Amino acid sequence: LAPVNIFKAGADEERAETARLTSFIGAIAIGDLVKSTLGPKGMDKILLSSGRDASLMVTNDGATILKNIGVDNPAAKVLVDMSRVQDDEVGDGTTSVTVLAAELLREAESLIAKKIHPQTIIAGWREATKAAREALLSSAVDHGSDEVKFRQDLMNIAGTTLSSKLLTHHKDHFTKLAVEAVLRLKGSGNLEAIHIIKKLGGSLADSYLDEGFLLDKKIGVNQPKRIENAKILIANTGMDTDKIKIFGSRVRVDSTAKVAEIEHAEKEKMKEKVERILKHGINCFINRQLIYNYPEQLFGAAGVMAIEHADFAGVERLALVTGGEIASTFDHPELVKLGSCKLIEEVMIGEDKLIHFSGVALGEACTIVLRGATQQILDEAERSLHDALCVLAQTVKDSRTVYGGGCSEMLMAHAVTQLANRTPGKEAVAMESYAKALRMLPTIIADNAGYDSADLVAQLRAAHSEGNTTAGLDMREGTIGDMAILGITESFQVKRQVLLSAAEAAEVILRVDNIIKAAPRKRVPD
Amino acid sequence: SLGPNGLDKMMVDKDGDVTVTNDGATILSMMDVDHQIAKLMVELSKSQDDEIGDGTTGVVVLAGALLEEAEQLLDRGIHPIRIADGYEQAARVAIEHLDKISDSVLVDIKDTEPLIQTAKTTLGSKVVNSCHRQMAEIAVNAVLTVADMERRDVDFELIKVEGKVGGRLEDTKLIKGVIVDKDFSHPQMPKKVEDAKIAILTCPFEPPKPKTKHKLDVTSVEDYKALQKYEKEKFEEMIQQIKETGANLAICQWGFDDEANHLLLQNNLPAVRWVGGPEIELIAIATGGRIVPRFSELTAEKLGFAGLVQEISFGTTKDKMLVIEQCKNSRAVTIFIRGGNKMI
Amino acid sequence: ITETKGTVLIKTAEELMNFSKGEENLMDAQVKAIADTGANVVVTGGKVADMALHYANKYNIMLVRLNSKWDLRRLCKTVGATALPRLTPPVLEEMGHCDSVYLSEVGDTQVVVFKHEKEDGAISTIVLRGSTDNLMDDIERAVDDGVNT
Amino acid sequence: LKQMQVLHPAARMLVELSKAQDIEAGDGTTSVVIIAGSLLDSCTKLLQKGIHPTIISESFQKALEKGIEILTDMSRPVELSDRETLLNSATTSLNSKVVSQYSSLLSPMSVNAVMKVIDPATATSVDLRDIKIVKKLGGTIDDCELVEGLVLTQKVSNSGITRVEKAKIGLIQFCLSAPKTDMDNQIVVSDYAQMDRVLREERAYILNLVKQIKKTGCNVLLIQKSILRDALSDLALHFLNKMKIMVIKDIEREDIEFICKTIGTKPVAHIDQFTADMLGSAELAEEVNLNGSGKLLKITGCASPGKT
Amino acid sequence: REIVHIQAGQCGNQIGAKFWEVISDEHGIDPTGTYHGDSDLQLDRISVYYNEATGGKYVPRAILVDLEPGTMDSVRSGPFGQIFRPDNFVFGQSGAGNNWAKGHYTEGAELVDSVLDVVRKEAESCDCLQGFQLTHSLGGGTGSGMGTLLISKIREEYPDRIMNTFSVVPSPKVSDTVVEPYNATLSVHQLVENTDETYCIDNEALYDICFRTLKLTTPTYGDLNHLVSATMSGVTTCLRFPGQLNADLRKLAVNMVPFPRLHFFMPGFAPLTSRGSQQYRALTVPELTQQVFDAKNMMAACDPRHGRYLTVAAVFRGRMSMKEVDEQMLNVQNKNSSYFVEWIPNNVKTAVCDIPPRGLKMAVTFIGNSTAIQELFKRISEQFTAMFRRKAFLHWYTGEGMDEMEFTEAESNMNDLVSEYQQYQDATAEFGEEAEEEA
Amino acid sequence: GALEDSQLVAGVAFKKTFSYAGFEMQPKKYHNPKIALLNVELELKAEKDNAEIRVHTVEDYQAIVDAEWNILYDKLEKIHHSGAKVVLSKLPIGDVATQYFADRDMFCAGRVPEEDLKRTMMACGGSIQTSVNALSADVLGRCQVFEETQIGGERYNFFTGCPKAKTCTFILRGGAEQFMEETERSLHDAIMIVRRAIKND
Ligand SMILES: Nc1ncnc2c1ncn2[C@@H]1O[C@H](COP(=O)(O)OP(=O)(O)O)[C@@H](O)[C@H]1O
Ligand SMILES: Nc1ncnc2c1ncn2[C@@H]1O[C@H](COP(=O)(O)OP(=O)(O)O)[C@@H](O)[C@H]1O
Ligand SMILES: [Mg+2]
Ligand SMILES: [Mg+2]
Ligand SMILES: [Mg+2]
Hints:
- This is part of a larger assembly, with chains A, B, C, D, E and F.
- Chain A is built from 17 helices and 20 strands.
- Chain A has helices at about 15-35, 60-70, 75-90, 95-110, 120-140, 145-160, 170-185, 255-280, 295-300, 310-320, 375-395, 405-420, 425-440, 440-450, 455-465, 485, 490-510; strands at about 10-15, 45-50, 55-60, 140, 195-200, 210, 215, 225-235, 250-255, 285, 305, 325, 340-350, 350-360, 365-370, 400-405, 470-475, 480, 490, 510-515.
- Chain C is built from four helices and five strands.
- By secondary structure, chain C is an alpha+beta fold.
- In chain C, the strands form two sheets. Chain C has a two-stranded parallel ribbon with strand order 2-3.
- Chain C has a single domain (about 1-150), classed as GroEL (3-Layer(bba) Sandwich), CATH 3.50.7.
- Helices cover about 35% and strands about 25% of the residues of chain F.
- In chain F, the strands form three sheets. Chain F has a four-stranded antiparallel beta sheet with strand order 2-10-9-3.
- Chain F starts with 6 loop residues before the first strand and ends with a helix.
- Chains in contact: A-B, A-D, A-E, B-F, C-E, C-F, D-E.
- At the A-D interface, strand 9, helix 8 and helix 9 of A face helix 1, strand 3, helix 7 and helix 9 of D.
- Strand 1 of chain C pairs parallel with strand 5 (about 50-55) of chain F.
- Bound molecules: adenosine-5'-diphosphate (2 copies) and magnesium ion (3 copies).
- One adenosine-5'-diphosphate (ADP) binds near residues 30, 92 and 96 of chain D.
- One adenosine-5'-diphosphate (ADP) binds next to loops of chain D.
C-alpha cells in the first residue's frame, strides 16, 4: 500500500487476488441458496420480513425469493438483476438461469488457479455458446398446422410447468383451466384480460374458470336485480354532479328566488342527460365513476341496472367480453354499439356477492376463481398459475418446442464437446468446462429426488453420444426414458433465453478485477 | 484497463448502485478522492473526454509515467523549471513529426468502409466487441444522416439513444424515425396506420381559458343555458377543424377531456396524449411538418407525413411504445439498445 | 399610483388592448415635458422604472439615483436646487446649476463628480488618498481637529 | 387465535386455517386446529423411521378420500319442514358456550330468524347480512327478544312527539336548508330594502317545502346524513313541529338498503317526486326509553314486510 | 409609510431582541450600525423599520419597557445592545409580581406617562406613520395588565392607525402561575374591541417541533425564540422588500378579516424539520406546501379536522419559476378541498419574494383563520369558571382596588366570543331525564 | 483543449441559453443580419398583476380570449416588419415566439445576461428597447456574419465582423478549472499594465 492516502474516510478498494475472491464467493452463494427449489421434487422456502411488519409468504419461484433477499455483495446484485428481467420476459426459468450462471463461475475460479488469462476463457466460451445454441435450434420441432396435434402440445407444456409447484397435487385439473383460458384470447397477448380472483375458504380443488364473467360490484338501490336478454351500454363519464363546467364562472344574484331558480336548472341538466341515455334502448348501464343518488332514482324509475366505480380495468375487460363501445357525449345513438349477454344475476361465493354474466357474445376475456385454506396457498396458487399462462402465450406466438427433463441440456453439452476435441490450445480446456456446467443441471434434478445422479448422468452421456437424441430422465421411477413417448416438452424461446442470459453474466463478472466502494451514507431518519 | 485485452472495474455508488465500466473518464468520475493532486487527474480526464471522447484512459497513463521519470531528475539536482521547459520542447518536436506520418483517408457516404474500420478500432476495447461489426454499421450511418457537410458540424441533440431491458444484445437496430414511450389515448383505437398525415398540436383539447384573472357572472337561467350550450359546442368545433384539413392522426402536448377523447374515436382518428417537449421538436423535424398552437391556425400545408406509425408490444409487461418510421429524408434518428441486464 | 389600494378593471375587448398603449404614451409626454424646460440631468431619491429609463436615454437625459435622505439634502444646497415631492416639470427657480457633471474612476473605484468652477459654491469636499484604511481614519480625525479650531 | 400474537412462522398458518373453517362453516373452528395439530405430531415418528416426506403427503391424501366416504355413509338426510331436528342441532352447537343456561330461550329464536329470511322451497344459500344484531347494555341475557321490524339507535330531533299510530313513513335524500348551488355563488346587496327581501324569501322557500310534504299525509320523516351542507335547519324543524310530523335525522348511508328492504319505502332525491306512491306504512312507530341505558326506537307492524 | 415596534415584559423583550438580530444580518447592517451590503435591493425599503442618523448610522424603531431592570440590563449588556437608542430603554425599580391588578392599576399608571412621551418622539421623526406592533405574553402581570393599559391609552391618542400585535397564547397544560386564568381572560376582553388582529402562538407546539421532530431532547427557551422569530420575520417580511403588488398592513386587515370581531389567526412555518430530514427530504414545492395543511406544522391546540377554515394566505420566499408554484397551488387547493371553507371559496393569497430568509434553501409562510380556535378559548373559560365559584385567591385582585364585578363582566364576553365562532360551523349543533310526554 | 487554442474575437460571443421546443428548426448562420435588442418579455401572459376581468356574456368571453393572442401577435408582427433577423432579450422568450420565429427563418434568444447585452450594443451599435412601437432603422445592430459553433462540448453564439467595435472577448482553453482561473489572473496583470502605460509611456 502506498504511504499516501487517496481515498476519503470510509472508502475501500479491493484488487486482483481479493476482488476475484469476493465476486466468486457471492455468486456461488446465491446459486447454492436456490438449488433446493429446482426440478419436479424441489421444496419451498419461507420469507419473513423484519421491516415490512412481519409479512410472511411461502414460495417456490426463484425470482420472488431473489427480489426479497437483501443482498449487499456487489457481484450478487448482478445475479438478482438477470432473474428479475427473465421473469418479465418469458416468465419461466428464473431458477435455471441463476444456477447455470453460478455454475459457470464455479468452474471459472478453478481455471484461474491453473494460470489461464481471463480473456482466454471468455474467447473460449464464446465459441462454446455459438455451437450450443445452433445445436438447440436443430433440435426444435415446429407444429401448428394440425389443431389436434397443437392442442396436445399446449397440454404437455402446461403439465410440465406446473410440476415443480404446489399445483402438482392436482395437475390434471389445473392443466385444463390454464389451456382453455389462453384459447379465449384468440391470439392477442393481453394477459391482463384474465382476472384471477382469489378468496379464502374451501378446498383447493374447488377452483374453476367461469363460463362468463364476474364483477365484484354492487347495483343501485331499488333497481331490478336480474335481467334476461340484456343490452349493455358501457360509458366513461361523470354523473355525480357532472356540472364541472370547465370555466371559472360564478353566480352573482341580488335575491334568493333567483338562486332557487338556478338550483332547479341544475337538476334539469342532469335529467336531460339521462333521457338521452335511455334513448339508446338499453336495459343495463355500466360506468367507471360514481353515480349520485339523484340519477340513481332516475334509472330506478326507468327499470335499468346501473353499476358504478368499475375502474379502467373493470371497464376495458367488459368491452372485450360483450363487444360494446366505451361511449361518451350520448348525442348519436346510431354510431354506438351495445353489448349482449343472455342473463345477468347475483351469485354468492364464500360470503360475498358478485355479478354474474352468462352467455356472453364474444368472451375474449375471462375470470378465474381460486379457493384454498390459507392465504399462503392462495398466493402460491395465483403466482404458480401466472407462470403457466405466460409460457403458453409465448408458445402461441411462436409454436416450436424442445424436449426437456434433461434431454435438451445433454444434447448441447455434447455438441460443444465435439468441438473442443478439434480446437488446439488452452481454449480447448475452457470449452470443456462449459460442458461440465450444462450437465450439472440434469444432475441437480436427480440429487433432489434421492437418486444416484452419477449413474443416471453417465447413462445419458453415452446415450446421446451414440445417437439416441431423445433420451432423458424419468422422475416417477428414477430411470431413463423417451420424451417423445412420455411427453416432457419445453418452449424453444424459454430455453434460448436461459442459455444466452446465463452465459453473458459469467462474462461480465469475469472481466472485473477491481472493486471500489464509496463511503456509505449514514442513517439519520426523519 | 488499456488495450483490447484490458479488464474492467465495478464501481459502487453512495447509495449502493452497481456500475461495471471500462471508460476512463467514468472511473475517475465515480471515484471519490481526497488528495488534491488526485482531483487534478480527474479534471484532466474529463477535459479530454469533452474535447474528443476517446483516449480518456491513455492520457492519465501518459501523464503518470511523465511524472515518474522526473523523480530521478529532481534528485540529481535539476531545477524543475528546467524539467518543465524541457518537456515542452520535446512535445513540440513530437507533434510536428506526428502529422508528417499521417494519412488522409476519406469522408463520403458512397464508400463508408474507411469509416467502419475506424469505428471498429474504438469498439474493439469494450464488451460490445462480441458484435462490434454490427454496432460499427449503426454508429457510422447515424452520424451521416444528421451531419451537415458544409458547416462541418454534427448535432447530438438530433440523435436519441434509448435502451430497454430484455431481449438480446444483437436486437439493437437503427430506426430512422422517432420512438416515444406512449400509446394511443383510447384503448379501442387501431394500433397502426400506413399513410399517416401527422398533425402536431400544442394547445390542450379543452374549452379556452384566459391567463389573466377573470370572472364570469351568471345572473339568470337563460345565462346558465347559454353557458351550457357554449361548452358542448366548443368540443365539436376543435374536432371538426382538425378533420377538414385532411389530417389522419393527432399529436398533442397536453391532456384531453373525456368528451373530446370519445369524439376522436367516433370520427376514426387516432391520437396521442401527454407527449414530451423535446419529442415534439424531433417529430416535427422527422416528419417534416410544423407546430401549430391553435386549432384556428391549422392548414393543410402544415401537416407532416409518415410511412408507418405502430404500437410495439414487448413480453409479459404492460409496457407499450409508439414508433414512427418510413418517412422521407430525415435529419433525426434514434438508436435502440437491448440487452439482458441493466449493466449491459 | 393611489396610496389606497387600486386595481385596474376591464370589461370589454377594447379596454384590454388599449390599456398597455395608453400607459406608455402618458409616460412619454411626462418625460418630454421635463426636457422642455431644459434639464440635462435628473436626480432621484428612489426607484426608477425601465420605461422611464428608456425614454430618458432617448431624450438625452442623464439619470442618477441615490437614497440617503441626507446626501440628497446636501446636494440640494450644493447646486441651489430645491426638492420636489411629485413628478412635475420643474419651475425655472427650482432648477440648480453646475459647471460640470461626469463619471470618473480613481484607484479602482467608480465615482460621480459634481464640480463647480466657482471658488465659493455652497459646500466643499476633501478627497483623501492613502495606502491603508487605518492611515486614512487617523488623517480624517486630524482634519476634524483642524476644522473645529 | 386471532387476538394472541403468535410469532413462529408455522404457527401463523393455524390462525388462518381456523378462519377458513369459520368462513365456510362457522363452527368447528377449534376442532379443525386440533386435527391439524395431531396430524403434524404423528409425522415426527415417520420421518425418524426413514419415510421421505413426499411419501407421507401422498399417503395422507389417500386416507383423506377414504375418510370422506365413511362419513357420508354415516350421515342421514334431513327435511327443512322438520322443526324438531333444527332445534336439536341449534341447541347442541349452543350448549358449549356461556349461554348454555339461556339456550332454552335463544334456540327457538335462532331458527325463527333463519326461517323468516329464506324460502324453504328454493333455499340454496343464506345471506346473514339481512339479519342484524343490536347490542344494548343493561338487564341480563334473559331479556333478549326478536323484533319483526326495524330498530334505530339515534334519538328523534322533534320536541314533543314520541308516538305515532298508523304512521306513513317517507325517506328523504335531499336537504331542507337555504338554497345552495354547486357553483361558488354569493348574494350581493346594494339597497336597504334588499335586506328585508332576503329574510322574507328564505322563509318562504323553506315553508314551501314543508307544505308539499304534509300534503301527502306523511307522519314520519327520515333524513340522510350530509357533511357538505346542513341537512335540517332550525327554521325547518320549527315548522315540522307545528304540522305534527315526527322527524328522525342522520341516517347512515351504508344501511339505506337495509331500511328500504325492511319497510318497503323508496328513496327520493327531489321534491317534485315526493308523491303518495313512495311511502311505506307501519302500524306503530315509537321510541322506547330503557331504564337507565338510553333511548331506543322501534317500528313494528309493517304492511308490506320484507325478508329481514 | 412607517411602523413602530414595542415590547413589554419577559417574553416580549426576548423575542424582540432576537427579532432585531434576524433583521440586521439580512439588510447588511452590523452591530455597530454601518451598512456593509453591496446590493441596492436591501436599502430600497430600509427606512420602514429604521431611522438614519448623520454619518450613515441606522437605528431601530423599538421601545423596550419593563418594570424590572434585570431584563433590560440583560439586553443592554448582551449582544446588539450598543445598536439600540440610549433613551429608548424604560425601566422601573420594583417589578409587577404577576398580579394583573398591580400592573393595570398601581404600577403601570405612573409609568405610561413617561413611556407615552417616548413614542411621541419616535413618531415625530416619520413623515407619515402607518401603525404599531406590540409583543407581549398573556401570563405575566406586566404583559397582561400594563399591556392592556398601554393599548387603551394608545387608542385614545391615535384615532385610526392600525394595531397589529404578536401575543403568545397560554397553554394551561403548562399551567405555571397558579393564577393563570385570571390574567388571560381580562386581557382578551380588552383585546377584542381595540386591535385589528392578533397572532397567537403557544409554547406547546413550540416545545413539540424542536424536541420530537428535530432533536435536542431538552430544548431551552433560547431555541424557542428562534422558532417564533422565524415566524416574526415572515408575516412581516413582505413589508421590507418590494413586490409586484404593494401589500400594506391595512389591506391585510380588509383582505384577511371578514368580520371585525373574529380576527385571531394562527401562523405556519414549513421548511424546518429534522436535521437529517432537512437534507434527505426532497424539499420540492408540493411536499413543502404539504406542510401547510398538516397536523404538525400548526402552533395552536385546535384540531382543524373538527373545524372549518375561513381564509388562508400563502407567502413564498426564494427565486423560482412562476409556473410550478401555481401548478402545485392549483393541485393543493383541490386536493384536500373536502375539509375547506363553508362559504368563502378561493381564499388563497399568493406572495413571492426573491431573496429568501438567510440560512436555508427554501422558505415559505402560511396564515390561516380557523373556527377551531374556540376549542382553545372554551378550555380557558371552563377552568376560569371552576375557580371563580370558590373565589380562590380573589383578595389579591379585589383588594388592590378593582371591583369584583369585573371578573363576572369579563366572563360574559368570553361566552359571547365563543358563541360567535360556534355559530359559523353549523355542525356542533348536533339528555338524561325521562320527560318526553304529550307536548 | 491545448493552451495555444485560445483566441480573441473582435466582437461579442457568449453562451447558449435555455431554449424551448422548436429552437432546432431555425437557421444558425447569417451574412448580413440586423440585430434587434430588447428588454421586453415576448410570451403569452397576464397584462398586469393588479388586473381583474368581470364579464357577463360568453360572446365577450370569446372576445377576451382572442384579445390576449392579438396582443402577442401584434408585437411579434412589429418586430418582423423591421427587417431584423436576430432578436435578443434579457427577459424570457416563450415557446410560441420561438415557433413563430422558426416559421420565418429568424433567430431568437432569451434570458441573455445583462453584461453580455451591453457589450453587444457597444460592438454592433444599436440600443436597448423596452417597447416595440418605435423600431427605427437606427436602433438596429449590424454585423458582418453570425454563426453558432461547438466549443469543447458547449454551444456558443458568435458575432464577428463589426468594423466599429469597442469590445473584445477572450475564449480561454485549459484542462482543469484552476488551469484557466490562473490563466485569467495573469491576463489581468497584462491588461492593467497596458492601461497605465497608455497614460504615461
Ligand atoms: N415431469 C418432469 N420430468 C422431468 N423433468 C421435469 C419434469 N417437470 C419439470 N422438469 C424439469 O424441471 C426443470 C426446472 O424447471 P422449474 O422447476 O420450473 O424451475 P425454473 O424456474 O428453472 O423453470 C426444467 O428444466 C424441466 O425440464
Ligand atoms: N352434549 C354433548 N355431549 C357430548 N359432546 C358434545 C355435546 N355438545 C357438544 N359436544 C361436542 O363439542 C365439540 C365441539 O364443540 P365446540 O366447543 O364448539 O368446539 P368447536 O369450536 O370445534 O365447534 C363437538 O365435537 C361436539 O361433539
Ligand atoms: Mg417452471
Ligand atoms: Mg478508449
Ligand atoms: Mg360450537
